[PDB]
């Protein structure tokens, strides 16, 4: 499975969650940013590694980071 | 002195390059397809 991590730099834009095409991320209540919300990655087992979340992340540097890891039928996005 | 017979190539070349490859490929393919207990 690919390793997805969220960093304190997260601003709670929710853009990564909206960009994810496999529902690997969600917004959880937080107190570190003004938006009072931070991105979480509770379903990384369904992550394929498209890195759309990173493309949607506007922080410098990225608050969401994807590290390609062990490959599975879900990770390879195989319908067979 | 350490000289193989004339038939050596007529036998060694067939075995090495055809027979041995087949044997090697067979065992190798089996191991890869085998799954951990």
């Amino acid at each position: 499975a690919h390793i997805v991590k969220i960093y304190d730099t997260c601003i709670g834009c929710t853009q990564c969650v909206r960009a994810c095409p496999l529902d690997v991320l969600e917004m959880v209540p937080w107190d570190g940013c003004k938006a009072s919300q931070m991105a979480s990655a509770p379903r990384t087992e369904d992550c394929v590694g498209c890195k759309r979340c990173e493309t949607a992340c506007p922080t410098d540097f990225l608050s969401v980071r994807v590290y390609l890891g062990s490959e599975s039928t879900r990770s390879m996005g195989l319908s067979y | 002195p350490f000289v193989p017979p004339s038939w050596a190539p007529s036998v060694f070349v067939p075995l090495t390059g055809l027979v041995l490859p087949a044997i090697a490929m067979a065992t190798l393919f089996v191991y890869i397809e085998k799954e951990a207990p």
Partner: protein
């Protein structure tokens, strides 16, 4: 299920695609990445691998000498 090859990377051994065969062959000499690798075991594996390389080189030279002495002029 988990295949036996490669034994040095459970990750690859749990890959259900043909990529497992290619990566198992491609990452066999990267000892530092092998599962449960320690610095001492890393050195001992390399030491044995170096004896293996030397064995191959001397057989290559013996093979060369033999074919010239047996089929050349």
């Amino acid at each position: 299920a988990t295949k036996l090859f490669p034994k040095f990377s459970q990750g690859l051994a749990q890959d259900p695609t043909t990529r497992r065969i290619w990566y198992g062959l491609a990452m066999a000499h990267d000892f530092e990445s092998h599962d449960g690798m320690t610095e001492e075991n890393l050195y001992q594996k390399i030491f044995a691998s170096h004896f293996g390389q030397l064995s191959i080189i001397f057989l290559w030279t013996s093979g060369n000498l033999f074919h010239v002495a047996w089929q050349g002029n």
